From a paper:
Canonical human TFIID consists of TBP and 13 TBP-associated factors (TAFs). Among these HFD pairs, the TAF8–10 heterodimer plays a key role in the TFIID assembly pathway, is critical for the integrity of holo–TFIID and also fulfills essential functions in early embryonic development. Taken together, our data suggest the presence of a nuclear import particle in which the TAF2–8–10 complex is bound by the major binding site of Importin α1 via the NLS of TAF8, poised to shuttle into the nucleus.
A complex of TAF8–10 comprising TAF8 residues 25–120 and TAF10 residues 112–212 yielded crystals, which diffracted incident X-rays to 1.9 Å resolution. We determined the structure of this complex by the Sulfur-SAD method and refined the model to a crystallographic R value of 20.5% and a free R factor of 23.7% with excellent stereochemistry. In our structure, TAF8 wraps entirely around the α2 helix of TAF10 markedly enveloping its interaction partner. Complex formation buries 2212.3 Å2 with predominantly hydrophobic intermolecular contacts. As observed in other HFD interactions, the two opposing aromatic residues Y68 of TAF8 and F162 of TAF10 at the crossover of the α2 helices contact each other via hydrophobic stacking interactions and categorize the complex to the H3/H4 family of HFD-containing proteins. The additional N-terminal α-helix of TAF10, αN and the C-terminal α-helix of TAF8, αC, contact each other on one side of the HFD in a head-to-tail fashion and significantly stabilize the complex by hydrophobic interactions centred on F119 of TAF10. The pseudosymmetric L1 loops are characteristic for the TAF8–10 complex, since similar arrangements cannot be found in the crystal structures of the Drosophila TAF6–TAF9 and the human TAF4–TAF12 complex suggesting that the overall shape and precise geometry of the complex is important for integration into core–TFIID.
Author numbering:
A (entry chain A): 113 to 177, 192 to 212
B (entry chain B): 28 to 120
Write the structure that this text describes.
Amino acid sequence: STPLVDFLMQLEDYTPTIPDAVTGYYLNRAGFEASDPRIIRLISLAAQKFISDIANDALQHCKMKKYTLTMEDLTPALSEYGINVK
Amino acid sequence: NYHLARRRTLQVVVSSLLTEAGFESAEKASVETLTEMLQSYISEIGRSAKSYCEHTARTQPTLSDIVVTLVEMGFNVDTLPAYAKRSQRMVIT
Ligand SMILES: [Cl-]
């Protein structure tokens, strides 16, 4: 129970792989700004996971033939992130 | 310069994420693709969060606002807590 709010609280403890400054730069570039540094860290982790999910998707393809990420395996993992389909 | 520094930072981030995912190598094109997608996703969150928070009467964005923004974007927030615990172990080299 409450696994999410537990995560949100200790965001101040986590140090994401992406520096706060870098995430901040790209957010401030989209016109978004936040003083709570936990907001920056939340966004950093979400962005990281977004890429991790793609990497894992790619790996699953690579397992369909010690591991090299190729465009052959990465391309299919991008199917949801192309041109906007109506 | 600053753009170079950012690109290098994201390269290392992507490198770490690929290493954690179980890759030992990667085609340059694939690293470049994910570096681009990473910075663009952060910006997308920013636009979405901006759009969302402009509806609230509070000057300061809240963590709650951002969670809702991610949901609006179709991000599965339920899985983040588990992911965050692994990431903390992660190392850059
Ligand atoms: Cl840039």
